[model samples]
Target: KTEVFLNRFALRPLNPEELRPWRLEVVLDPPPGREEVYPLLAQVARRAGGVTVRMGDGLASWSPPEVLVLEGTLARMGQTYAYRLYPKGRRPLDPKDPGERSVLSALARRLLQERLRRLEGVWVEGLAVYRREHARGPGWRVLGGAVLDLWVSDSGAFLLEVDPAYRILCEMSLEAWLAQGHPLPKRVRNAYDRRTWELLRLGEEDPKELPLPGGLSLLDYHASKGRLQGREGGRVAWVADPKDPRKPIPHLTGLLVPVGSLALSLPWEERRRRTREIASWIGRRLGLGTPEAVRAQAYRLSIPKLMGRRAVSKPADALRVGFYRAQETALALLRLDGAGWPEFLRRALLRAFGASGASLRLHTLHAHPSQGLAFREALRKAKEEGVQAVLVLTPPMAWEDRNRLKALLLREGLPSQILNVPLREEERHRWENALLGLLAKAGLQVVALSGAYPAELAVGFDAGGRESFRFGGAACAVGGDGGHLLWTLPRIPQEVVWDLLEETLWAFRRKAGRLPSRVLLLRDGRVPQDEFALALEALAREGIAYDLVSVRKSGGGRVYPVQGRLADGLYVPLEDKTFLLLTVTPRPLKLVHEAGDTPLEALAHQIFHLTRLY
Candidate 1:
């Protein structure tokens, strides 16, 4: 893929002005099958001035040697040439049979004849003939006939015969003639003589007299050819067209395909049909049977509407949308089995809509267990604006401990109650008694449990340690006095978690008429060092009001606290369970440094809601 061009010393030394002239060799392995070779050669020839086919014989006519010879010209003459070894076909050939040839040999001969016939002043002549004998390796066997070296050259043009033996003699003759410093050879008078004489004159001209191409002067071609021959570092530049200004002259070494021609060749109607087929396949993959279902599924996967105004924009933009839609549909198809279609659709719709620039607004907040007046005031403001859910990220600790703290506040004459039901036979008695006492004291109508339980259980407790609960046909009962406990679950799979989180958040928004304001917490003694730092930094730069705080525990099992306003009434409660509670301890910084986990986990969590536990 790397190319370099050089010019002969006779011309100015290789400089940026001459850099574009070099042609990089285009190497096709095994010389492409005869059937394919013509088209490829034509392609190359159309791009460059012409192409020369080097016949590969074992010893006397090896590929490397031919390449070496051509490369010499490429380096010093600024010509580009392709080198390849012909592949043998199934048809065999006899050593003595003149007509016996492989597909490539036939093609080469045919091409030579065709090119010679088409060119006005071109002719071919056999200088020397060689055949491989069984006993002695391949070598030149002089034919019993006069040998005629052919060449095409004029004051500003040159085409050299590449036969090794002919080249040697031609070089010697030119050297001898130049040694005497004689006048240059005259241009041929007729087409036949012109072809023959010019071909021979290839080695006789002053290097500057040979006209290569715009990018490749004779000198540049020679240098490139030399480097290739010497197997040294060099590059070639090939002109796509000498006259076409819009066309690019590419470095021969770089991979290039003619995009315009290729596009023209493809069947556009067929391609459009295939696109539709692919869309259908995507729907099938997402497990959508009907068009509506498929559409809904596609929406969930963030598939953009293809027939809209935006869909027919620029080709690049259209392609991007197509790719995104395809991926979404594919992923949705994979989740066909147990995944909730509605939830998936919600997520896909959010992604599609959000990416299109949907705005998020806080709607409502519902705090519980006799909310502190200061915290309640902030909640009221959020609620007035239509905040969604009151996110309670609690720490991993005993509910009994939380309840005990609540009792302390009650003792100070602040109305407070542990929002929970009863659990266990022994705790049932105490729970029932406490509830009756609280109800009498404050005329409280209902107790709300801020925990993972059905809605009805917190209504009242019984002596049997069992309470009934129900919500939307989902019902359950707890046996034993219970304090509202913050439960934790094992990390869920990323896809499933995000699907659920997005669904839950959307559901809450639907109910509250607004988007939820998010609150992140770093658990006391449990913060992930890297995540904590990143969260803190995000909070600082987000432009939105947020908070960050660190908490520590005191002796005697008492929860100690520190607090501050991070931004405009956004309080950073450095206390346990008051605002947000984080229980997952951060890994030690030194240990993380020595044995770091894959950063992908943290990155995934940051980008998708599913990665977080709470």
Candidate 2:
């Protein structure tokens, strides 16, 4: 009978500087087709270095060395030796299409080049081949070659050797032998037996023996009289199973037991204590303690809640919570507690007040002035109480009301700063005469055409009506001036209100030598005051440097004006929300145009026609 003995040498760890090559050898019962094996072997050989091929006596061998110098004695009693070549690197067989370069190939080339380049006095040696085999049942036929073997050598001296058939036999026998000592439980053994064929088909014939690239020894042991012992030249040493001291323990054959004594033999609680201590040390160093706080904060910042519900469920939620929580903690610890706080609060309060404050002020005004006498009395009182100017709303007031108010103002010697009259030419002349008379009687300094006045009055005044009528007709008219006439322009698009305000301010600055501190904005109560206040706050924040007091016109709508503090500077409203402040140093009359004579409807057109307003 032919006897086969398999031995395995313990593998040493790979040296950093040394090349650890690998090879695969397969021995087939029905030997592989030469057409298939030749090409595959050829491909591997050419890429490696050189291959030596030999066949003899139901045996075939192929050895590839690092150098192209192929040398191996061919005991060619009756066998065939052939060689084929394959392209190197990842170069494609067809030049037009290149294949992907493997990571392994790239790493190997880089490492090999570096070692070869730096080392001196090193000669090309034979190649190393790692071998493994899968076996069918016995009595297999040989088609071309029977026994297959591959080896590695340095300078033609064997460094690693392999036998394909013997390795498989040893693995199969070792697994069965190991199973005998610690027989699997009945159910497990039954399942394993039923699937053994399938497992074998899937190239897993031996459960205990793994087909590691380098062969490792296979060991077995037996039990004797409540003791454990080694078998087969001390290939395996046995001990007591920690789980059950009465059970047998088998160490891998020829390997020293890793642990001196089984700590697992101790009580379960003691073992857990030791394990937990090690785990705790690891946890502390990794900074895993109290991670929830960081996680929560991150969630709050990045996650926009839809009515206090997450918009989406995702990992980002956790990340955001963690990040924000940590940030908040850091900020709290460092006491970095000042950004947008008091200033934001103040601005918000001002905005809220500015929007709603008009109502409060208007309510105060309405309560004081119940009628024409009260209104006039309140106006006088306001002027005395530090109100620089008064804006009267005369929207077609009853003739009796006008007369009564006119008499009261005349008696009080108060100014008739503005007057509203019909569009008739006769009424215009009459109103002009009345204004001149009233101004003389009251010693008024100015007169504004009321919002109720028709545009025709402005046209007639600007076009020079029949005769120039000065205030008081040379009585109180200083140097025969027309009592500094003022007229309201047509209501324009809301969007252009800012531009018009800007143009008016600039015109005033150029002509009057200063911006009007108490200029009034007459609105028809169409726009929301809240939005308007926000616009004002935006203007303030933009550093336009103006204090604005928004007043509701008693009979008109509303009026917004710069408060007393910003009188000497020009105010240019760039938008509903933006304004510019310019310092005007010159006074020029040509800058202020007559709105009646000019065809300027909207602020944009006016600004376009009059660029100097900017």
Candidate 3:
């Protein structure tokens, strides 16, 4: 609860803009108690961004609501390690409860069975789990193999402390001796096998970067594809799969979060001939951890991975899909008087691949009507890598000025056009149909609908970007007709979720001729189980039975749809059929699982197409 007195830094919380650029860091209260408690902002401070990326494969254990700190003894006495843990079930253990008898008992047990298979011996030296007398364990007890002070949060997340700098442990135990020797156990029969593990080319490098985020660091893969692909030295470059260790890559993957990656758009070329200084400047600005490579010779690193899309499966014959196409489409601007940017994109440019020479000219018109007219012919002659279609985006100007520009550009008839504004829905429909018509002419069935058509409705809930503090809403996209019902509320809570669904349904009913048969709700992530229930209750009230599935734009437990990997070959685990998981929240995902129910796949295909069409 926000009201709970937990040393939370709610006082004059940083403004959203200020908060956006800064991230959270983790550490113990300075003289370092090695406890799970918050330690207070006055004592210390850790994002890593909304706490999502913190999930990893390690032995995860939790203290019951009543347990307290642990004290280790004997040969295993002085080792400590760091660890991060996620809660199972809704209610989590509080590492911060300080009540007397809040200290209880807990024997050792692994929460998730498959997490600790095949790993090196990890260790932890100190632990404290806060708990109680009646029902923690056998008595007011300490987990010999665990942390005693278990800190919990109002939001169902836990902050734990496992010492010797928390790490994945080899094994745990509640069964132990009192500084004295215990009986040895007889060995059981087991299958014996040996494995030759892949060692890193180099991590744990010199001047080791400390206070690093968890997991394998500094992974470089010699991919089999382009530029730096293949074996160089004695090592075969490969990357670790963040989710499953078994699914590795021959190259850098979307799953590989570069220790060097940054949020910078690009080098501020103006500042330094040295990109490292530029990188340093940006890193400091974004509050990123400094890289260890502060070498005499500089280096540069930019990660488009965080900004790219990841389709879980392969599509049959998809478009030349590259969110990564071209250089970062940068723009300068010049407005017609009070209407635009001060700089403008250069009208004429030259690039390669145009030596064989086809079409495709990307033109820009910004100065004035006459200046743009003069610039047009020069732009028309610019060279480029290759050709498919020429797309010209016009800057802000009077409508009449826009027409004159288009009229001027269109007269040449070298397959040219000017686009000053976006297309209307009807206009987009017309264009889409024309494109689909071309595909149809090519014998491609471009679109498919419910066999029930106007009868069976597919509904989607897309709660886009966080608009504001406790203030935002959802956009319900109707599948049959390209219709979107947008609604925002003064506050954001589960109740708004129910109201939005009900409101959208009312809107859909008004638009459609009648209620539909077999409704399908494609929700974002775990579309609050409660919200879905409310929607179902209302639907049942209207006698409408429906199927609800989750579509993830980001994090989740292993759930994969048909499309298997990103372009980099990182695998997305499957949750269920057609339940697609995507990494690139910016790019719309493509449904590409062949050999499944044709109708359901088709419907899924259409939704993704519309979901990303804009």
Candidate 4:
């Protein structure tokens, strides 16, 4: 039996009258431009009294005839607003209708925030609420706690979802953070880390009051400066700017204000239980009745029989029958200056590729400097050598450099398998996967789904580029049999998603001599509705059937097993068009069929099987 519970709890309003529908219009003086509207409205929402307004949207409410505080804020911002005291004439909420349900959700969110503001916690605007008191003590790598979200379901029932949120902040001030000796890179990978540093503010005193050395008042000291350091406490050395690094200024702890955060990483069972703990608090605080568990529907996605040399269920066992070998090709070993490649690695590669019926002739390419034109020169020389694939034994390097090397090899039409330096005999087992990857890189098929699929040509579209130029789009097209056909990397801007689709279709036609019966376009994240319309129109003009899906790899929330542990291929159809496929992570892959005719069940199965193809 499949048994599980969603991280959701249903709620009933303490006073049903509060659920009545309403609407509002916010008018700005001089009519603020589109870009300026949100910030202006946010300021009004933050400052206005006797009203709970939506953060960016103008939806809001207030007591009877007039609210002076709201008027004063609107006047100060050069803005004004109007609201319908009763949209439905104060009728009972009709949750079945989409319009009514949406209004109810908006009101519920605002009401929840109003109630939460009265409690002892930090209310992250437009997000969940958290208590810093619940945070794990400092000195830990991450500060952990629970975060509560108040949501209204499609059925017009209020619900609360609790999830683990983590904060990587350890220091209370910029100087303290800098003193910790954390290597400050020019850029940060995580948004929260960037925010932790960027949001620092100067002290309570006015700029006119504080004075600094160098005959510079606090105001002028803030304006411009030069480097000067003093060790004896009176003068503190500080880098004034990141871009212009020559200027150093004195630092003061009181001048910097920091934001604190809480973290949480709960076990499956504990999280399931915590849903009640958080909901109980909400019910008591907001005067709502006891919340109920929102029962989740469990779905089973049948596993597809995979075929390589022979029929097999597991990808590892498919190797016993040998992979679908393309042709005998030559591979080049490009070793960087470091520890030499171990003999066992070569033997392992030989056996793995040989089993796949791929006869490999190995050649060696000398190492080159990672900087300058040295690496590019080596790639050009290897291209002249007519090598089909390259096994790059490189030293550990930055992601930007790694991507540059990969791009260089791609331009040379050389498929490469990159491995960090110092290959060891003990890690032969660990290197098995990379060897298989190397074989595939040489144009050999590892495995394919056993049966036929409606989606004949599957194109995976994603936005990618070097860290510096991240606006480009990438696409990879594969046949129904999981045979790789084309890979177009970060060349076109992502705004031209349709252009990417057009290129993929052109490649498909060039290879197959005609368009396939059906196509599957899977994006890495949320599909832009308007941008995808262009692609859909193109497909319609071509008269080819297609399935357009956006695959969200995270934030689908956790799934728990009431009995035995959860299994792979388990799915839950959250709606008619959306389903979650459980694979390696308990937080499953949420696939939304933005446009398609294939049954969601079959699509889920097809996606699960495709995971094994890699």
Candidate 5:
């Protein structure tokens, strides 16, 4: 430990101000020609965070300054190169680095990377994040490791496909590893080529993708997905085997709870211990490797830990928010006498709803509602007053008694919500925020996108050599309050795919008094382009634009990260940033906004927030 730090200098790097600055002064040499390239090089300087003071040419006093960073490059190169900056270097300090690109371009790439990881919901493409035991058993470390794929379900559960080679080396039983001696990297071993040797067959030439003799495999790749720390509810994310479709995978099992953080979900501390138990359970299922000296391994994932647990998150701010439009509310009290009691309850409700500044009437009703006939007058007044709901200070009455009054009250199309607690100035508005959140902020729209057709649609020759055509078509949208409206026609009959459009403005019109300008659709499974084309068409037709990305609850055989080193190929902004892997491949990847321009990151952040909603 002492030697590690001795040569490493201070653990922290210098501040921005402290780092020596190398300003690239762009000199067109002829100087008058500066107008053409001034805008470009100045932008490069600003982006690169360097001083763009004019100099003789692209050369600065090869002298360094405490507050300057010297780097030079041309905005463009004709036959004569101002400086042949096309040479590339991955690191900042490499002398050849600045010669390759403008410092601003380099700076922009670095910033985007910093932005990606720091982004709560976004991540750099290609990297499979995982966690492994550190400090022996208790502590853990997240690894930018490799994996075969990653998946999630509607229940907010995830399954990361573990790289076969990774598992072969890390998860194989000890004796198996010592004996196998670098058995063919799991990828080459077979398609799903490897099997655990729990039955103790380490020397088999071709082990099936079968579980060890006991049908058990260990899983708990503690992948840590970083987000803003303020997420109020605890969540349990999983890294598991995607192929396990055995019994109990559905119906009775649901990853709905957070452990130890609250009552239902197990805490992070117990993820592994529970992972071990699930492994044991799988072994027990096989009726082999039971009560063993060492725990057996399994391919199927049964996280008894997350079973039956759901997730929760702090309420997200409503987009395009508005109060109940022109919605008027009134109050009523079971007043035995006019001791100003009704006024008090009315004031309390008003203040609770952030409407204290506005004036509202407090209507009075009979205490026992015995003179329920007079209740008709109170109900009529509420109707005349245009009240949407009336808060009633009804006493602790039985359901039978209250139901009768409610039936009469509700007949007028006026809903009455009773506040049964003692109507007092005491307890200090205890339920104010609670009631406000319940009544005022109640409506949220969840939209689902089910791609109507597979992405790879084609006219192909049948195996029997007959012409066969696979047809493609529409999509749908569902929301909690969104009427979960079907997005578009499920089948677009023509070889020409229709621009599947929708009028979703109506979905939020009632609640928000306007259309929800933004709609995020999570697909139940893999999404195809034809299906998405129709979905995008629906938004465009309805005059409602949206950002549509298939929320993959699942992932990749051939999927690979686009950027290699952390900074290898940093993103340059624009639609070109959307340049991803080949169009045919679809993994649990991000879909950059391909529609009309909207701050893509804003919706990206919101979808991220949605993913946290267990």
Candidate 6:
């Protein structure tokens, strides 16, 4: 289909009457002299009332309701009471100024947050404010809602994006939560999770500041004897002021578990309808448009074909046909100290491995999964045992434990897979998919584009770090022939992008004995354009043709089918240099051809095909 629905709405522009900007002055009771004060200015504004605050030439300004409250509760425990607000004369927002444009964008978000808060919902750690309980499941309550984000186009138009969001609340008390075999904090320093949630308070009036317990510790609560005994390595913990020990104060706070709620996992058509309903509801409340007028924009785009293994069109069938190549011929099973894997699981694993053309060897380790140091020692022995791949059979564990174990493997630079123990009879198909991942982790070429095309080499660039410091990395893949991919370790900052590209080109030359006909340079997100310009300049100097593309996983809104159900390989060309690629999610990948002579349609086609090259 040529026409598709874009999950974006045109927000009515603010009238002159609605445009009221105020000059704000925030003063701390005991002001810290010459210490950066602008950082705390926004908090004061939020406490007084909701508004986006920005500092310009040492003057704080914002548009808002009249500031009635001089002082209000701050997020900080003790210092919150010391802040005071002073509202100066009103000022108008200058639309031409870039700084004011930023303020306007922030103001838009603040307005949306305020409107959502009016629904009287709990804001779960600034993620999303849930108005009503959507559904209830075992030990969890799912709150259904959408987060509204305002996007300002380069044309100065306000486009509102309604994204499906959820809040999964674990209803168990702190003690009950810990009792379920969750990790216990080993020391007082690791108590960040204890006081993060909003506690329940049943009283006549809510206190200005939520009081926190002095300390938290795991203790054996004997119900029959009505005694609390402290012990080592226990699950449930108690939170109380040491002065008032017998009176155990409890609250409704528990865990804010991972989302991926069952409620949002609706079929394609159903999800599209739900998303439309949400947008309409929000649009009506904000007076943006009528409920019916809240709809997707239609645009024509040329769709592309996804050629797979043996010319298979679908991803599932492509996998079933055959893999490009199998790298790891042997798998090492490292069983952690837990409930052993069932015989059925073992059989399923063997069958999958055999189907993938690999042999399996099992080894038992007495170390617990949480015991990373001991697990590392055991893993070293497995490496020496002549295994190409390592598989850790672990009991279902918390996210922290899994991450810790995976981090150890990552540091070792070993190809590995971790499977939870007790795979049931119903989940037999999981092993089939796991086999593909396991093989890929072991440097196998599962699949790739099937035909020759422009842009024979694709390089992906990304960066991560803290504060002003940065580290960047690059991964490059050759064409459908299934050559080994080369990746650079994130070593330097933005300047390293050119160095990484040079390294990748060098690796390709060394492996292929020549350069690719054309290179496709992919970036994870938008960054300093000049940084890449210099790199591309080098490519130009070498006379090596290349295309630079920026792929943003988020910010791109939903792309719904006008008639039939949604599927992979739906490409919508939005502009000459920009397009949308839909794979498996309502949100499409917003692709921008930053620099390239490659035709946009051909580029989109190549991108769509790459999505299938798992």
Best by lDDT: 4
* Cα lDDT of model 1 by residue, 250-310, tens digit: 2221111111112122242443233334333322322212211110000011111222114
Model 2, range 227-281, lDDT digits (tens) per residue?
Answer: 1343232333333332223334233232221112121233424433333332332
Worst 10 residues of 3 by lDDT: 1-10
Put the candidates in TM-score order, highest first. 4, 6, 3, 5, 2, 1
User: Which candidate would rank higher by TM-score, 3 or 4?
Assistant: 4
- How well is each residue in 1-614 modelled by candidate 3, as lDDT tens digits? 00101111111112222212212223321223433233222111111111121111211123231231211111111233332232343222232342211211111112111122222242223232211211223211222222212222222222221211112211211122101222322111111111112312222232112222343332321122232333222212343333224343332211121123222222323211222232333223223234222111111111121111222121111122211112222122222334422121121112211211222233332344456556555334321222222233344444334434434433432222233333233453433333322222222222232132322566555443322122334433443533333221214445555566666566567767566655666655533444455557777888776666555542221211122222321122221233232332122232323222335434454444434333
Please provide, for model 5 over 1-614, each residue's C-alpha lDDT reduced to its tens digit, 9 standing for 90 to 100. 00000000011222232122243444333333543555544433433333222222332211234333333344343312132111111222222233323333233223323333443332233333223322221111122223222212112222222331111123332223333443322211111223211111123221222233244321111112222133222221122222221111110001111011212334423432433343333223222123221211111111111100111112111111212221334544443323345444444545533422334455654334555667677677666765544455545664334445655665665545555655564543433332332233222121122222111111101111111112333333334322323223213322222322333334345435665555554442233444456545655766664554433223312222222211111111122213111121122233444444545444343433223222
TM-score of model number 4? 0.74
What's model 1's TM-score?
A: 0.15
Return model 2's CA RMSD, one decimal: 40.8
Clash counts per candidate, in order, are: 60, 13, 57, 3, 40, 0
TM-score of each: 0.15, 0.15, 0.29, 0.74, 0.26, 0.61
RMSD (Cα, Å) of candidate 4?
Answer: 7.2
lDDT of 3: 0.30
lDDT against the true structure, each candidate:
0.26, 0.26, 0.30, 0.60, 0.31, 0.56
Candidate 2 deviant stretches above 4 angstroms: 1-66, 69-97, 100-253, 256-308, 312-614
Per-residue lDDT over 73-117 for candidate 4, one digit per residue giving the tens place of the 0 to 100 score: 344332454322212233345665655555556556666677777
Identify the runs in model 4 with alpha carbons over 4 angstroms from their true place.
1-3, 13-21, 29-107, 121-144, 164-171, 177-194, 197-266, 310-321, 333-347, 364-381, 391-407, 416-437, 465-470, 490-495
Highest TM-score: which candidate? 4
Higher-TM-score candidate among 3 and 6?
A: 6
